[PDB]
Design a protein around this ligand. Structure first.
Ligand code: UJK
Ligand code: UJK
Ligand code: UJK
Ligand code: UJK
Lengths: 196, 196
């Protein structure tokens, strides 16, 4: 019966999804770019094998999508979405992990500023202004900074790329702890500990 | 320790590989093209997470590669390999499942003839002759058939596409039976049977 076989494949896809999310979180925290890139490709492919997702599975795929956009922050996509990777992460973030309001607002604001600053860092001030117009007295100060190419303004040092990465890594630690007990990781660790 | 974490991820990749091979075999036997295409993409991505493979894992990836080329038989690749999909499957086949010599020779010969016949079926007789020259009295008869566009010659009806698919599907049944007891499939089926 391919009903029973199809159901077992859906159960296994769900397990593979959690395993790849946990692996993606670890690679992001560790700074292992090539590993992150490979795990991301695997998660994206496995996600195609699922056509119906539970509330928990939706949150999992969106954390994977959010981290993928954060990792591409300083890098076709702009032709399709007409926005920068960090603007996409901001849109994804706006619908996930809202219940920790304090840290959610902190991460949101760091991404908003960095979506502008990464364009300035790359020498594209016209793009930095286009990003500002899509996201946003406070605005007049931010516009003057972009106009004057004031990349190292004190505001940008408090709302830095490193600070954005640090806050996101602290959030990643909660996801990594929450998913550390998923089926495939526990079974994988039991085999490694037995050898050993 | 990322040594222990990396080892658990290697164990889990090995389990995912077997699961996706078994799923690819079933989709190939069942004729589920879209499912096969999705499982193939997932297997290819998961295979990147492995850098060292055992003898059994090598045989698994090559069955996945062989079935992928067989499925693309009638469809960039020709720019890179300078050959047709069936010629690639023939090269992969030449190094796997040799110990069943009888069925191996049968599948080999059906692919050799079909690598030529699928070009004739598509109206590309110049390509059919180029395929013949790369693969191969018997040759004079095969060359005359191509020259005269004798697509429905009695030789082609014994060495048919359907006969090639049937023999390959019988081989796929041995792989499907051999891998039906792998870790992820057995655990997936236990969860489905408990619910039901
Ligand atoms: C849709 C999306 C949003 C954010 C980050 C990545 C992806 N994505 C999925 C895939 C795929 O399925 O290949 N590629 N890219
Ligand atoms: C990005 C930023 C930096 C510093 C202070 C405030 C803000 N900000 C908050 C909001 C909002 O809550 O919408 N928008 N912008
Ligand atoms: C190398 C090969 C031989 C035969 C059939 C498929 C593949 N392949 C692997 C991949 C990948 O890793 O994406 N794509 N294609
Ligand atoms: C493809 C085919 C159809 C009919 C009879 C023989 C052959 N063949 C065998 C061989 C070989 O053993 O190399 N080559 N070609």
């Amino acid at each position: 019966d391919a009903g029973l076989v199809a159901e077992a494949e859906a159960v296994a896809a769900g397990w593979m999804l959690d395993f790849l999310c946990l692996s993606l979180c670890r690679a992001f925290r560790d700074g292992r770019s090539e590993d992150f890139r490979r795990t991301r490709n695997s998660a994206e492919a496995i996600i195609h094998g699922l056509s119906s997702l539970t509330a928990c599975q939706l949150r999992t795929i969106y954390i994977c999508q959010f981290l993928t956009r954060i990792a591409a922050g300083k890098t076709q996509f702009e032709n399709d979405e007409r926005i920068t990777p960090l603007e996409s992460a901001l849109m994804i973030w706006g619908s996930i992990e809202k219940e920790h309001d304090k840290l959610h607002e902190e991460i949101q604001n760091l991404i908003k500023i960095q979506a502008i600053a990464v364009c300035m860092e790359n020498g594209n001030f016209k793009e930095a202004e286009e990003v500002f117009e899509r996201i946003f007295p406070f605005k007049s100060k931010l516009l003057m900074i972009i106009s004057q190419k004031d990349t190292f303004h004190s505001f940008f040092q408090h709302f830095s790329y490193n600070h954005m990465m640090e806050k996101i890594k602290s959030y990643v630690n909660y996801v990594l702890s929450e998913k550390s007990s998923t089926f495939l990781m526990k079974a994988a660790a039991k085999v490694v500990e037995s050898k050993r």
